[PDB]
């Protein structure tokens, strides 16, 4: 058994983290007070769920997690929330005033003052681990803390834990739910600084989640609560292999091995199906073929883009529920003859498949109906570069006029960092183009 430590940074990271651990407890039969009657070994153990949960002598199952935010209001909700007994005060870190949607404020000004505190709290979790394998880091691109402090934290983690893998779950900015005009600045700055310190990053575009909630859950105006419970289901599908008995993606290093052939190109596209409204009284359960077919539809992707006009480097299928290998292969065979699936020449055209018999767990009173089977596809496709192109274009529009730049320089950041960050993104787009397109 090898432990994983989750780190939740800023409002988005914390609120998503709260939704994930809520779901984790429901999936593992852990009560809000920490007790888990299924676990017969009291005070310890090396089961698969122990990768995410430690144990006390009283029988409390405690999340291997740290929550960090530069203002206290969001984390204070965790301290008094339903699962307040789950976490102990040392795990929840709050500052006084936030980064004001300013990367430089989060990275340099406030980051410098709190980075040592956060690392020592992480050390305390790491000291409990017999064989720590790495970290899962949750944060937004657009927030000052999410962008700025995360990139600093990721740098220091590479220093203090050189052999440890680091995975990201990153919230990509969408103006429909965005809170800052400068989020493109923050996104490019944090991607530039974090790029060499992250082994595998799962980007989630708020635009995609927003539209899935409207389209499939019939929610007229999705809130963060609606968005986070859906994101939580996808995150759960991705991390399920670490928390349950299995033979695929059983360790963090395997994510890189299976999904990331080239280091810089470490942003897999996630696609999830099915998403069905709980308010829908009459519903017909979808088959293996149908939910697998839905994995190649842009409307179900965590980032809107067109994989038909890109190339695949790797593809992983993660099933939950009533699924057998026979039906998966029959589904894939049909899809290959009816859809455009181009792999790069230096990679085998194939799928790694994982099946967990336990169907998806849904929060009671949530928006998601319980289904007999679901699937999350993780595919490393060059089509996700469309998201970088969009972001870089918005960056270019503002930076050409140096709009808002003085806020960053005022926090001690050099104007050159804008250029260096943008040049790095230009190279990243070029890398995708070289791998993906022809002539």
């Amino acid at each position: 058994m090898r432990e994983c430590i989750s780190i939740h940074v800023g409002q988005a990271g914390v609120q998503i983290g709260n939704a994930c651990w809520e779901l984790y407890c429901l999936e593992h039969g852990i009560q809000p007070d920490g007790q888990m009657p299924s676990d017969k070994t009291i005070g310890g153990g090396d089961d698969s769920f122990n990768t995410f949960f430690s144990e006390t002598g009283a029988g409390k199952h405690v999340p291997r997690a740290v929550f960090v935010d530069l203002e206290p209001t969001v984390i204070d909700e965790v301290r008094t929330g339903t699962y307040r007994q789950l976490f102990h005060p040392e795990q929840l870190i709050t500052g006084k005033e936030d980064a004001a949607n300013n990367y430089a404020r989060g990275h340099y000004t406030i980051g410098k003052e709190i980075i040592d505190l956060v690392l020592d709290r992480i050390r305390k979790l790491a000291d409990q681990c017999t064989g720590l394998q790495g970290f899962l880091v949750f944060h937004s691109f657009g927030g000052g803390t999410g962008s700025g402090f995360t990139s600093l934290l990721m740098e220091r983690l590479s220093v203090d834990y050189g052999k440890k893998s680091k995975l990201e779950f990153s919230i990509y900015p969408a103006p429909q739910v965005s809170t800052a005009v400068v989020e493109p600045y923050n996104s490019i700055l944090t991607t530039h600084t974090t790029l060499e310190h992250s082994d595998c990053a799962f980007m989630v575009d708020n635009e995609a989640i927003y539209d899935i909630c409207r389209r499939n859950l019939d929610i007229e105006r999705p809130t963060y609560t609606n968005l986070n419970r859906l994101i939580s289901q996808i995150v759960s599908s991705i991390t399920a292999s670490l928390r349950f008995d299995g033979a695929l993606n059983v360790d963090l290093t395997e994510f890189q091995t299976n999904l990331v052939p080239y280091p810089r190109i470490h942003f897999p596209l996630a696609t999830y199906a099915p998403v069905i409204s709980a308010e829908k009284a009459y519903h017909e359960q979808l088959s293996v073929a149908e939910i697998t077919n839905a994995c190649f539809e842009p409307a179900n992707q965590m980032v809107k883009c067109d994989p038909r006009h890109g190339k695949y480097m790797a593809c992983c299928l993660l099933y939950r529920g009533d699924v057998v290998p026979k039906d998966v292969n029959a589904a894939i065979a049909t899809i290959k003859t009816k859809r455009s699936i181009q792999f790069v020449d230096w990679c085998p055209t194939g799928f790694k498949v994982g099946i967990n018999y336990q169907p998806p767990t849904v929060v009671p009173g949530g928006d998601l109906a319980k289904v007999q089977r679901a699937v999350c596809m993780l595919s490393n496709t060059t089509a996700i570069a469309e998201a970088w192109a969009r972001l870089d274009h918005k960056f270019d529009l503002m930076y050409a006029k140096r709009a808002f730049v003085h806020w960053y320089v005022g926090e001690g950041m050099e104007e050159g960092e804008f250029s260096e960050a943008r040049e790095d993104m230009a190279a990243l787009e070029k890398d995708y183009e070289e791998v993906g397109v022809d002539s």
Partner: protein, 423 residues
Amino acid sequence: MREIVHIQAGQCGNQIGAKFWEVISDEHGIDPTGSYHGDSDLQLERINVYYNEATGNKYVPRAILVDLEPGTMDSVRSGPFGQIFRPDNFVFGQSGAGNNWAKGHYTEGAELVDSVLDVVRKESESCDCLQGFQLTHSLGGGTGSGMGTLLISKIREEYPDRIMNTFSVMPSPKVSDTVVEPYNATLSVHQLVENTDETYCIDNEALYDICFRTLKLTTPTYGDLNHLVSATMSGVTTCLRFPGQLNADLRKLAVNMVPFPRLHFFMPGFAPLTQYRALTVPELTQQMFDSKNMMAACDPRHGRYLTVAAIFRGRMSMKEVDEQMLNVQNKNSSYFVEWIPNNVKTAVCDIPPRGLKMSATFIGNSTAIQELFKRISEQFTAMFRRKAFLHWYTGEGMDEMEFTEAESNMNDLVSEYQQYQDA
């Protein structure tokens, strides 16, 4: 708890500031005694931003009242909510400033300023985490304009890393007290360009026009004008006073609204302009963008929006709000600068203002605001070219060169707006 410290200076400053506290005390369920008698807990969740808690669960405005003469502040203390202010926070002299920026800034104000800063320091020390300051004042008089900007400079010296915000009332010949108002306003704008992060430009010309043309008030009084201002102030501070995601604090608002340091002068708007018929969301949205609902007497169509913040209050479809806000942008995209993507942000608060089912408040950083400054500059030059009325200022030790510098800087500001209007 991120506290704001409120300061009101001079006649205009204290009269509009008093009305502001009356309005938001009512919104937060605070009676004119400090006692809370509301029904919703949304009223108290962010009450500490503007109020301190005293003995017996009393709420006291974090407000400092300043003037160089006792008259207006005597009237405030005799007012309806007059007893709610902290007695020690009344700081006043006896001499007056005679509508003279120099008296407020250099002589009479200089004698009083340290005692104001003592009170400012006392309030700041009580704060768990001070955001910054908001000042209400006029630019056309002596105390609010001269001593008000003196105060801003001194505060910035002691609290250089805090946000400075002002509600600044711009003078107009239509509603004028003295001929030297353009002098006092030009000297003040110079100060504001350098030492504030956010300034709401409240034009008395616009206020008068709204009362007369739209509200059909035959003979508008300052009281009628202040009704519009207190309503505007309530609306633009809604995001600060209630739970929300967008512009929830002074610094996040500034980062969203101010792309260039000197261009931080906002045109505020409000709808509906105040019978029993509630306004639909399309009506709120259309009216809040209408020039007739603007408080700066500038035509938005004569310029472009760099950034816009819109706040909707009341029970309404958040979906319909989004659609209408997108509708405005998509059908008038020429008036929004292209080089700042998604530059219009919208917030919705469930608590509506008193007497209204639904309300909308508009905050725009528009290049059309240059019309306001050009108006002042012309009135300034008309007198200054003949050195008219200058002896009032040179008598207080000021030199003509200081007037030339203020004029040049405001003309520079106008030029900078024009640059980004064409960009």
